[PDB]
Structures are given as structure tokens and as C-alpha cells.
Design a protein around this ligand. Structure first.
Ligand SMILES: Nc1ncnc2c1ncn2[C@@H]1O[C@H](COP(=O)(O)OP(=O)(O)O)[C@@H](O)[C@H]1O
Ligand SMILES: Nc1ncnc2c1ncn2[C@@H]1O[C@H](COP(=O)(O)OP(=O)(O)O)[C@@H](O)[C@H]1O
Ligand SMILES: Nc1ncnc2c1ncn2[C@@H]1O[C@H](COP(=O)(O)OP(=O)(O)O)[C@@H](O)[C@H]1O
Ligand SMILES: Nc1ncnc2c1ncn2[C@@H]1O[C@H](COP(=O)(O)OP(=O)(O)O)[C@@H](O)[C@H]1O
Lengths: 397, 390, 98, 98
DNA sequence: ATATATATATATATAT
DNA sequence: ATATATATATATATAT
């Protein structure tokens, strides 16, 4: 396992505004809202990486619609670019004005790995995404996720997000914990990971070979179901406890008479499945739901990314089988509601700053990404290709 | 002889943030509504399990839409999550507003079983689910429901509700009274129910054998269904009542019998994989089996078009679901608007056969260890009964 | 049918409906009302004047009428069975007009 | 493109934008703007550096470019050859990816 | 300001 | 498998 040292360090940026730069801002906000029909008091300020909150508490009889209908004029009042309005803080009575900083601050990925939350996260599939609105890192478990969608326009950063999630996978698990299968119809960027001791097939060329490896994923799911129905327990990690935590004393624990190894995690990462669903038809569309309907205890998790998120490629046949979604900067509230049912993803800044709904419900989370360089990736790839070997399960195609 | 104290007792009830100072919450609500353009009077609080309904009496002249257009800012004012308004109470003149206290008291299943009418229940196959909006015991009866359909939500307890219903079956029968049979392509969440003496079938793992199981299902159906017309009643409740009054008349008629439930779930894989013969059989073990004792609960993950066609949707009277896509799924099974207002992970929308409005139920969790204790307690008194026509 | 809002009896003639559509969302009574009209047919009739044919989707309740001397066929269950009865009615109407 | 309102040409790159929609009602400047974009391309790029593919659904404007050394195809007046050009473009895109 | 009728735009049911 | 229509949702100028 290679260390954290190959990334760029946590630099120093003094662009974090002065307390006067927020205080005069806050008094100017109170003056400008007092010039309209509303009346409000700034209760707290939270600075941020790019956008910046304002905990404001309206006095009495001041409905939030009288802020959300002043929004654009308030934005031109403070001479900033635009303002989204927080409808509710969870647990706290105040509404929030989100104002983006002009000099936005890029968040390096080693800053995301710098938390004690990452390295002392008990799971084997962390998904380090980046610092939130307030600046705290939010890293969530893929095993409890259980699946992800990624959508955004061209250039909006989906390659960077997928590289961030994959390097989140790489730094924590051994080869015998979490294998992965990569599929890329846009045959250009995800070939960079070829050579690691984690990656089952070679990183594929066409869907013509990759659909058969996805049927192999189906058969691996059936192997997993047969062996967990036989040996008794339900979760994958429950069974992987059950094997070694029975064979403290040395035994292979023969099973339905071959041996028993550990039970690794499988992660299907797909670059652009819109191409695959278009150029095949509905067979692969059936395969995706057939995976994602029987997966959470199977230890096969699905990462998808597209470019058009419309219902031509993501039907209701998938839409209830992948709860957790991420959308990057998109072009329409149509597509916004389509892959983020709350809607609001058309107001993104670009270059990361995605929406995210947790494994709760109905409440999107705006968390910035991590600008991961390709050379950081190349260092990590060299560090794995020295610390390992070309391990493969062939005849997967 | 089934035991009832086999599982864990009522440990705590969490006190719901106060037993007394929610009067302060009520006064704060009064002040917050007077801050807007209504004047209101608050009567006594119903401190429910998770949510909490308030007796709220508006003054004269005001309409209820001035509460409905004001609910969200009432909610952000009152330091709570998400409230809504019930615009009618049958009886008195008040207006209901329900508020979700966040400390969700996890519903102790043996406390649901400790209900007096659960012990005093007439039929032999009841369905206990838990507490209501006010928190009442909600023991229903699938001898009267008598078909049930479950939708799919990955994190709500679709498995937990099935095991709750099955333990509800188990603690109120004798082996010569209840029979069950399962079909599940996910052979994972349910196969702990092998070794049950209440069975009348081996636990069906495959699907061609499930197509052999539904054949014996309709065969037994039409067998007893024309035998019932031979014995001259109309419904199978009448059939079992009269064969009870015949066997406990002491006469050995034997002219050529217990209940039978079909706890098939994940039925989408049958209706997608093996073919159309599944739904062609399910349509006629669906509608006609109503007064036939075969009650046929069902559960899938994504009910829209192929998974449920209308000739299986319509026959089942009474339905149950969890939080699903904000699309046609929101009312395909649920019959109302329940897209994401159902919280999931504890609550559910019940429909009785009459009064087609969704009664919302606080469900009760069941540990898999509780399931294993019940499986082992029936495994002690565990003489099986398999049949091999399948 | 019953009484109106004044409580005066409201009885209609089926020969001048000429047909009838019944609604109800498992609400007030949808089985009742059909049963009511059918028993009201039966109390002023003879089988040489009015014989009925029912089609039963859910064989629940009106599989109770079997045995009466005005019922031209037994209970009908399948819709594919019921299409034969509907085409029988069309053919009977056609020879009726002939 | 030409000037903005504050007296400066705003010359935007096509290699980053990276595609383009142009629309408007008749006579508002459509074919003139297309000509401006084309002559903007032509005064820097040799046929080594760039080369055009042109499709005319109307044989009125983009017919003058017939015979410049910056064409991969003749000016597509026809309709089926336009589909052929799009097939070729997808094929050239995929082989350049490989 | 705010509920109403209208025009536009999307997702699904279905004929070939 | 593909093209077509209706139902449903959604944004918009208006009389209240
Ligand atoms: N967090 C970020 N901060 C700044 N720029 C970013 C960030 N994430 C992505 N980008 C920019 O987005 C571009 C990548 O977009 P890309 O994923 O290639 O879109 P597509 O794959 O659809 O073409 C990169 O050039 C990168 O500079
Ligand atoms: N009353 C409850 N309290 C706590 N958790 C619950 C309760 N009811 C259900 N759950 C949760 O529901 C989950 C079960 O989901 P499940 O029915 O297995 O979905 P699926 O079958 O689609 O995987 C469990 O993880 C459990 O934590
Ligand atoms: N006037 C009445 N007073 C009291 N109960 C009635 C009255 N009319 C009908 N009902 C009851 O209401 C029930 C409504 O049933 P119904 O909606 O017809 O069931 P279904 O929709 O399955 O036919 C009837 O079964 C009947 O017993
Ligand atoms: N910058 C300009 N100055 C003056 N006239 C112009 C200018 N741009 C366009 N026009 C007029 O508009 C016409 C181009 O419109 P065109 O592209 O033909 O629209 P369409 O093709 O829809 O008819 C030209 O013939 C010219 O007369």
C-alpha cells in the first residue's frame, strides 16, 4: 500500500476574506434587504471554499418566498454574480443566503485525504469527494451507498470525479479486498489504470466484449448468492468476517471439496454507459437492473457516468434500483429533476461543485470535488505497478 | 403451544423530549402562528411515536389554505424538519397539524404483540404492524384483506415487514391451522424459514420448480374450490367454518382443512425470466382465490409495467408500500400520493378494503435474531410436512 | 333505488334508461345497489318476461343466484369466456331485429 | 465575431467552446454570420491545420466555397450524401480515438 | 400578491 | 425494435 506522499501538499491561500470583508458585506445585506419589503438580521457567517453562507434570521411574518422572489435583484444589489437561497437548515431556524466568492479556491485532493475521517474509516470502499460548504470533508461508504450515478455536461469534470473515486478506492484496500472492473466506450482516459493488481479484466475496448464481462458479473453474483445461501449469512462483509474469524486456527474451511479464500469486493465502474445502452438496445439495459436489483448484499457495487441523463437512457427500470445519485453541472432543470429529483442542478458553477443525495432522502448536498491531476494518477499507478503484479481472472470475456 | 415472550421486551419509550414541556412547544406554536396573519387556539397534544399531531383550532373567518400555504415557514420557524396539515378531523371542529419529533422511538415488536385485541383476535391469521399516527395497535386481518401487495424500497424494511407479517402468522396458530409456501428468486432474505413445521412445501429456491409450485397452487385451489361448492357454501371462510362444524360434529365425512398463505416475493424475476405463464397463472390465482383461503401476499422492487401488469394489480384489494420513485410508482400500488412523503425506514401506507384513504402505520422492526429464535422454537416442535407434486 | 333528499321514493323504469353506468371507489356501496336493483327486478316479474345473464369478474357475491328459473346461463368468470356471452347477446339482438 | 457594444472585437475560440448553435428569424444575419465564421477560419489555418465539411440543405449560400483546398467533401447539396458524411465523421472520430 | 385557465414540453402506452 | 398519440406534469400571462 503506497502512502499519501505522492499528492500535492495542502497549500496556503490567504484569499479567505477579512472579518470586515464579511461584516461590511453583512451590513450591506441588511441594508439592501431593508430597502425591499423584508427585514432581517445577520446571525452568523460561514466562509467557504467557493460559495459562502449567511445565517440570517427574519424577524416576524417574513416568509421565505419573499426572499426567493428577491434573489436575483438582491444578487445585483450586492454586485455579486447570483444567489441561491437555502430553504432550510436541518435543526436550525434560520434561512441561508449562499453567495459565491469571486476568487474561488481550488480544493486539492490531499486536503481531502488529510482528515482522520478517511484513514480511520472502517470500510474498504471510501468515496472521498471533497470539502463541503463549510469546508469539512464528506466521505461516504460505497458499501452502504449502494450505487452511484454521475451526470454532467462535457467538460463539467466527470473524468475528474471518477478518478477521485477510484483513487479513493486505491489508497485503502489490498488486492484481496476490493477488485474492480472498468468499462470505457470513450476509449481514452480510463486506460491509465491498466497494470494495477486490482483490476479483473483488462480495461475494455468496446461494449462488444464488455457486455459479456457484465454477464460474468451476473454469474459472479449468482456464485455469491449460492455460497451465501449455503454457508448461511447474508452480508458479504458478514461472511468475510465469518471465514477468517472462524479460521483463526489454520484451516482452509472447505465449502460447497475445494478451499475458501477471502471474499473480495467487486466494483463495476463504467465510463459512459449511454453509448452502451444506445448501441446495444435493451439487453444491457436489462442487465443493469438485473445487477442493481440483487446487489447490496452481493458485494458488487455499480458506478455509472453518462453525458445525457435523460429518460431515453435512464428509465424507471433503473431509476428505483440506484438510490444515490451525483449530478455535475448540467444544462436544464429538465435533466436536473431527471437525475436529481429535488432539482436545482442547473445552477452549478462548473468544475465540480456537484449535487449529492445521501442514503437518507429528499435533501441534496452540495460538496465540491477535488481537482486531481493526471500526473498524481500516474505516480499512483507507478506505485502500484511496483508494489504488485498483473493479477487477472481471465476468460471473463 | 407457541410462546410470546420469546423475543425482547419493552425496554424504554424515550419520553419524547418531555412529558410536560411540550406545552411550551404548543405556546411557541401559538406565538408563531400569531406572527403570521392567523390567530389560533391550541388544544391538547397527542405525543405520538415519531410524528405528533396537534389539536389546533383556528378562529373564525380564516380559511385552511392560509395554513396550507404557510406550513413550510411554520416548519422552519418551529425548529422542526418538515410538517404538514391534515385538513379534517371527523367529529370536532379542529384542524390537524402533525410534527415529526426526531427521536424516533424504535417500535418494540413484542409491545405490538402485547396488544389486548391481538390476544383477543378472532381469526387465526392476523397481521400486526405497529403503532398509528396516534399510536394505536393496528392488528389487521388477512383473512379479511385477503390479498396483499408490497412495493420495493431498499432501505425501508421490505424484508422487515415480510418477517413481521410472518412472525405475526406464527405466534397465533397451531400446525394443523396454518400452512405457508414461499417463492423467492432472492434466496437470501427468507430461507431461514426452512425447517418450519407450518410449511406445506420445501422452500422454493429455483424458478422452474416455482412454476411447478403455482401449478399445485391452482390445482389445490380448484380442488377445494369445487369441493366447497359440493359442500354448499360460498366463501372459504364459510367452508372452513362448516368443515370445522363437521369435524367437531365428530362425523368422519372424508367425502373424497387449514388455511394456506403464499408468501412469494421478488416476483419480478418470474415475470421477466421464465415468461408469460407466470402472470397467466397469477391472474387466476389472484382474483378467484379471494374466497379460497389462498391469500397470496407479494413483494417486488420496482412495480411499474412488466413487473406488475394490471391483471394482477387490480385483483388484490389491500396494498402496502414504501418510499419509491416520484413517478407512476407513487400511485401504481399506493393509490394516492406517497412518492417521498413516506419517510421510509419505519413507516408505511396501509389501505383497508373500505375507506380508500391511506392509513399511515409506524411499523415494528424484527431482528433476524428474533427470527432465528422463532425458527428454533418451531424447530423444537418441528415435525415437517413436505409435498412432492411440485 | 331509494328515497331522495325529501324522503320521497325514487323509482325508475329500466325500459327508458335505456342503459346504466355505476361508479364508486369502493366507497358507499357498489355491490349493494346492483343487488338492490336486481332484487327489485325479481319482486315484480316472471321468468317468462325477464331473464338475466350476469358476468362475474371476481366470483365473490353474485354467484348466489344460481338455481333461479330466470337465469339463462350459470356464472361467467373469464373475460375470454364472457366474450362468448357478449357475442351471444349480439347474435340474439340480431335475430331479435330479424 | 465582430465588435461588442464597448468597441472591441470578441474573438472566441472554437477549440474550447466546443460546438455551436446559431438561430434566428429570416434576414437577421444568419448566413452572413456563417460566412464570418468561415472567413475567420480561413485566414489562419492551412489545409494541413484544418479542413472543412460543408452541408447545404439549401443551395444558396455555402456554394461559393466549392473548390477551395479546405474541403474533405464537395458541398453537400443532396440529402443522402449528408448522412454519408455523418457516418464518415463518426467513423473518423472513432478511428482517431483508437 | 395570488389562484386560474392556457400553452408548452416529457414520460409512457401502444400499434406495426 | 420503432414510430406515434395521449396523459401528465410544468412554466406562464391573466382576472381577481
Ligand atoms: N474540482 C475541479 N476544479 C477545477 N477544475 C475542474 C475540477 N473538476 C474538473 N475540472 C475541469 O473539468 C475538465 C474535465 O471535464 P471532463 O470530465 O473531461 O468532461 P467530459 O469527460 O464529459 O469531457 C478538466 O479539464 C478539469 O480542468
Ligand atoms: N423499524 C425499523 N427500525 C430500524 N431499521 C429498520 C426498521 N424497519 C426497517 N429497517 C431497515 O430496513 C432495512 C431492510 O431493507 P430491505 O427490506 O432488506 O430492502 P431490500 O429487500 O430492497 O434490500 C434494514 O437494513 C433495516 O435497518
Ligand atoms: N346505507 C348503508 N348503510 C350502511 N352500510 C352500507 C349502506 N350501503 C352500503 N353499505 C355497506 O358498504 C359496503 C360498501 O361495499 P362496496 O364499496 O360496494 O364493496 P365493493 O366495492 O368491493 O363492491 C357494502 O358492502 C355495504 O355493506
Ligand atoms: N451586419 C449586417 N449589416 C447589414 N445587413 C445585414 C447584416 N447581416 C445580415 N444582413 C442582412 O441579412 C441578410 C442575411 O440573412 P439570412 O442569413 O439570409 O437569413 P435567412 O437565411 O434566415 O433568410 C443579408 O442578406 C443582409 O441583407
Amino acid at each position: 500500500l503506497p502512502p499519501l506522499s505522492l499528492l500535492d501538499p495542502a497549500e496556503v491561500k490567504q484569499k479567505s476574506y477579512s472579518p470586515e470583508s464579511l461584516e461590511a458585506m453583512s451590513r450591506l445585506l441588511e441594508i439592501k434587504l431593508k430597502e425591499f419589503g423584508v427585514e432581517v438580521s445577520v446571525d452568523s457567517v460561514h466562509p467557504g471554499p467557493v460559495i459562502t453562507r449567511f445565517e440570517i434570521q427574519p424577524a416576524a411574518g417574513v416568509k421565505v418566498s419573499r426572499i426567493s422572489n428577491l434573489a436575483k435583484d438582491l444578487a445585483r444589489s450586492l454586485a455579486v454574480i447570483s444567489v441561491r437561497v437555502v430553504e432550510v437548515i436541518p435543526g436550525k431556524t434560520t434561512v441561508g443566503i449562499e453567495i459565491p466568492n469571486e476568487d474561488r479556491q481550488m480544493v486539492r485532493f490531499s486536503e481531502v485525504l488529510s482528515s482522520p475521517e478517511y484513514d480511520e474509516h472502517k470500510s474498504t470502499v471510501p468515496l472521498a469527494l471533497g470539502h463541503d460548504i463549510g469546508g469539512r470533508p464528506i466521505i461516504t461508504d460505497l458499501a452502504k451507498m449502494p450505487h452511484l450515478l454521475v451526470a454532467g455536461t462535457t467538460g463539467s469534470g466527470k473524468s475528474v470525479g471518477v478518478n477521485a473515486m477510484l483513487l479513493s478506492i486505491l489508497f485503502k484496500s489490498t488486492p484481496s479486498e476490493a477488485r474492480l472492473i472498468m468499462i470505457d466506450p470513450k476509449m481514452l482516459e480510463l486506460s491509465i489504470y491498466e497494470g494495477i493488481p486490482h483490476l479483473l479484466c483488462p480495461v475494455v475496448t468496446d461494449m462488444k466484449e464488455a457486455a459479456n464481462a457484465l454477464r460474468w458479473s451476473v454469474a459472479e453474483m449468482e456464485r455469491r448468492y449460492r455460497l451465501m445461501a449455503a454457508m448461511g449469512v447474508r452480508n458479504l462483509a458478514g461472511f468475510n468476517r465469518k471465514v477468517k474469524d472462524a479460521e483463526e486456527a489454520g484451516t482452509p474451511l472447505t465449502d460447497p471439496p475445494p478451499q475458501l479464500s477471502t471474499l473480495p469486493t467487486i466494483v463495476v465502474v463504467v465510463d459512459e454507459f449511454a453509448d452502451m445502452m444506445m448501441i446495444v438496445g435493451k439487453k444491457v439495459e436489462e442487465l443493469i437492473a438485473r445487477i442493481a436489483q440483487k446487489a447490496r448484499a452481493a458485494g458488487i457495487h455499480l458506478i455509472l457516468a453518462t453525458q445525457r441523463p435523460s429518460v431515453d437512457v435512464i428509465t424507471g427500470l433503473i431509476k428505483a434500483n440506484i438510490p444515490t445519485r451525483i449530478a455535475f453541472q448540467v444544462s436544464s432543470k429538465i435533466d436536473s429533476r431527471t437525475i436529481l429529483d429535488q432539482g436545482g442542478a442547473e445552477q452549478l458553477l462548473g468544475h465540480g461543485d456537484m449535487l449529492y443525495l445521501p442514503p437518507g432522502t429528499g435533501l441534496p448536498i452540495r460538496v465540491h470535488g477535488a481537482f486531481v491531476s493526471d500526473d498524481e494518477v500516474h505516480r499512483v499507478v507507478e506505485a502500484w505497478k511496483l508494489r504488485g503484479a498483473p493479477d487477472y481472472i481471465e476468460d471473463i470475456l
